[PDB]
Symmetry: C3
């Protein structure tokens, strides 16, 4: 894109997630397996947070599975949605809100690096 | 139901999750795809938190997949468990603990709404 | 093993997750359904935190699904990765980093126990 995370919108003040759409029209089938969908949105994330990509319920019920994805605080690449058609052919129109990004606190530990 | 989240119980003081059961007896097969299971439990959530629905390991190993679900802080509807039979026929008895609700902090950002 | 969580490493300072490998060579197929992979790493977790097991994207794209798993703060058993081959035969070499553990804050509520 390259657009940053600050450009994403949350649907309501109580909404935990920032909505993510695919930039492309994509058709998915079960036998295709996991596919990485492009968003045109780029890390990195606010200080001391990491990101979690999760599906929206509406889209899940429609047979599109979003695999939970961890976004590191310092990742500066494109944020892609890992998705699979569950049972049937799923068609993703450009600009449909497929997933959501949740920001979570990044806990410090003494683990080696 | 309508019952609130305060009515849920956690199995041990160290348990991260509040246990969720289905109110109905339900049979699930792989070709059915994602099904929304009723809990009779309703949002909303404590201030400055959001909720995450996740599966229990025992139930996962038994072939019932729970799709991660985000519950918004201000959602006042019924909390439903999005589930799928993975490989085989899964039978869910009324009152079996199928999923768990985790409460997480809702981080404030300057994202447009 | 028994090794504690403090022995795990994080790949970069910005990495949210602690990397998890299987201790065994394992072959997985779709018809096998969910399998619990041994890590040789044991709870419990730092005070006031709980753990979440999630997949790595690279491994997900390769057709290995990791089911999100909650680790309770006071769990003192072995941390196992719940996994399934999605579409094809997946082979897991001993010592490949399959999953990651994320630490999250454990919120106190007045829920009965
Ligand atoms: O597993 C789930 C996921 C979502 N919801 C409810 C709570 C959410 O705030 C609301 C809207 O979800 P989305 O379609 O925007 O994901 O649906 C559930 O009951 N269970
Ligand atoms: O992916 C997982 C999920 C759970 N557990 C362990 C830690 C939990 O505290 C314990 C009990 O899990 P449940 O059956 O209640 O989900 O199992 C794992 O090792 N890996
Ligand atoms: O759904 C996902 C999961 C991961 N990533 C990006 C951000 C991560 O920091 C980076 C590396 O992920 P891993 O392979 O280590 O999981 O990939 C995504 O864009 N989408």
């Amino acid at each position: 894109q390259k657009q940053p995370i600050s450009k994403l919108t949350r649907a309501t003040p109580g909404s935990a997630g920032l909505d993510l759409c695919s930039t492309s029209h994509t058709v998915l089938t079960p036998e295709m397996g996991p596919q990485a969908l492009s968003t045109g949105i780029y890390g990195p994330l606010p200080p001391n947070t990491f990101g979690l990509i999760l599906g929206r319920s509406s889209i899940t019920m429609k047979g599109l599975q979003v695999y939970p994805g961890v976004i590191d605080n310092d990742y500066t690449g494109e944020i892609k949605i890992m998705a699979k058609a569950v049972n049937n052919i799923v068609t993703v129109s450009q600009g449909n809100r497929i997933a959501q990004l949740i920001l979570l606190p990044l806990i410090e530990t003494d683990n080696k690096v």
